[PDB]
Amino acid sequence: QPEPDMITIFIGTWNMGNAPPPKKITSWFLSKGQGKTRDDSADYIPHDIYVIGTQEDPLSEKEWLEILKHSLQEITSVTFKTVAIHTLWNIRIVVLAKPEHENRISHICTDNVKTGIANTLGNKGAVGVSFMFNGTSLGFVNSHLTSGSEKKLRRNQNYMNILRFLALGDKKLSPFNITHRFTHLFWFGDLNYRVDLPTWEAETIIQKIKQQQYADLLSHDQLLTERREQKVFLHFEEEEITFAPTYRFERLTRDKYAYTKQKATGMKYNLPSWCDRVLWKSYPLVHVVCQSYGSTSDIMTSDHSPVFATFEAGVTSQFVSKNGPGTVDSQGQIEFLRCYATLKTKSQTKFYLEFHSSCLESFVKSQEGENEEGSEGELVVKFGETLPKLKPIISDPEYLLDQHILISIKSSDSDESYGEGCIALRLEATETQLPIYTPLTHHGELTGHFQGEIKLQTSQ
Ligand SMILES: N#Cc1ccc(N2CCNCC2)c(F)c1
Ligand SMILES: N#Cc1ccc(N2CCNCC2)c(F)c1
């Protein structure tokens, strides 16, 4: 039984509009409809992992699990194992995996975040799942963000609360939020960003959709434009959208968008919009390739169409040598030269670094850096040649070049992280000084940069 170096992952997001699904939803799991669709020749090939996010889901977990498993069994003739299911209000995440993966999957975590306060607390937020797949950490966030064309800022706030407070993955990674805890992080849901065009242009928008001419609409998609201005989802990717807006349809057809203001909408227009989205963030130089991104055309119980995305994702094996795990491997070391952090902070305190990696027995604290002023006002924290020599548990290059070092820069005064980032050990050379770089974030906002040189010694 060889361990895989690649898996495929299905991501689905559907706002079910508080209606039961139709009897057949197989088109969703087959990535068939509009957009970047999956080749017919793959229909019987199961994905390794299926992650299903619903919003406005009226079903019990039991009712939905039965529909999902029976759907996949009809497609694949495989009885999928339930990895996890977590529901907050009517927001749900289900993770299913091929039975051969049962022993490869461990450290399963679930959590939820409720967004807003009083008025704004009661139905929006996120659910999430994480786990290990052999040596690879996977996270999944299904969020239902604030609705309404005039609330993009609220949505961006919801995003930041979710990434700050969703507690998934390795708790030992205490300085790091979910945007740094996983080899691969998929974030999807009814993110509720709208096409921000005048109300009077509704029929023009519909015309453009019927012509499959999305360019003039996507140029006003609030998620793309907010991402472009680094207001939200910084360092996440999204595949090009080549499918029609997935909201707001008349139910039981896909022929009609229902956009006009109604008492039932709070007298808000719902111009056709790409509310339903899949984004990802993977550690640097890990294989991740989107192989489908689209919407179904034949599932019409909701005022949203289901969205699918599929990915090839690189994975690593659970490595054992004569030495680590359970000791260091003296044949391995990670050295840092000419390193400095550049920080946006207006504060003057001393800083130190923490290095966190599953290639280390535990995290490593550096000495304090030396603060200097940058030529354009910035705080520069010089580590020069002072950073420690890191001692990985395994020196085999087939292991070590697949690893990553998370970096937090912390205040000596408060022990609070001012910035977090990640460095790949997938180097062009070993025993060679090579440039390294990561942006630093805190609460998912850019706070600085870390750069320098690395010298990696493996047993080869
Ligand atoms: N596919 C799969 C799969 C793998 C592991 C678990 N479990 C749950 C919590 N207890 C121990 C581990 C599971 F439910 C499903
Ligand atoms: N409209 C738009 C838009 C275009 C580009 C980006 N970026 C740059 C490339 N890398 C990250 C994504 C973006 F966020 C939004």
From Swiss-Prot:
GO biological process: apoptotic process; determination of adult lifespan; immunoglobulin mediated immune response; intracellular signal transduction; negative regulation of B cell proliferation; negative regulation of bone resorption; negative regulation of interleukin-6 production; negative regulation of monocyte differentiation
Compartments where located: Cytoplasm; Cell membrane; Membrane raft; Cytoplasm, Cytoskeleton
Keywords: Apoptosis, Cell membrane, Cytoplasm, Cytoskeleton, Hydrolase, Immunity, Lipid metabolism, Membrane, Phosphoprotein, Repeat, SH2 domain, SH3-binding
Subunit structure: Interacts with tyrosine phosphorylated form of SHC1. Interacts with tyrosine phosphorylated form of DOK1. Interacts with tyrosine phosphorylated form of DOK3. Interacts with tyrosine phosphorylated form of SLAMF1/CD150. Interacts with PTPN11 in response to IL-3. Interacts with receptor EPOR. Interacts with receptors MS4A2/FCER1B and FCER1G. Interacts with receptors FCGR2B and FCGR3. Interacts with receptor FCGR2A, leading to regulate gene expression during the phagocytic process. Interacts with GRB2. Interacts with PLCG1. Interacts with tyrosine kinases SRC and TEC. Interacts with c-Met/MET.
Family the entry assigns: Belongs to the inositol 1,4,5-trisphosphate 5-phosphatase family.
Biological role stated in the UniProt entry: Phosphatidylinositol (PtdIns) phosphatase that specifically hydrolyzes the 5-phosphate of phosphatidylinositol-3,4,5-trisphosphate (PtdIns(3,4,5)P3) to produce PtdIns(3,4)P2, thereby negatively regulating the PI3K (phosphoinositide 3-kinase) pathways. Able also to hydrolyzes the 5-phosphate of phosphatidylinositol-4,5-bisphosphate (PtdIns(4,5)P3) and inositol 1,3,4,5-tetrakisphosphate. Acts as a negative regulator of B-cell antigen receptor signaling.
Protein name, as recorded: Phosphatidylinositol 3,4,5-trisphosphate 5-phosphatase 1
Gene that encodes the chain: INPP5D
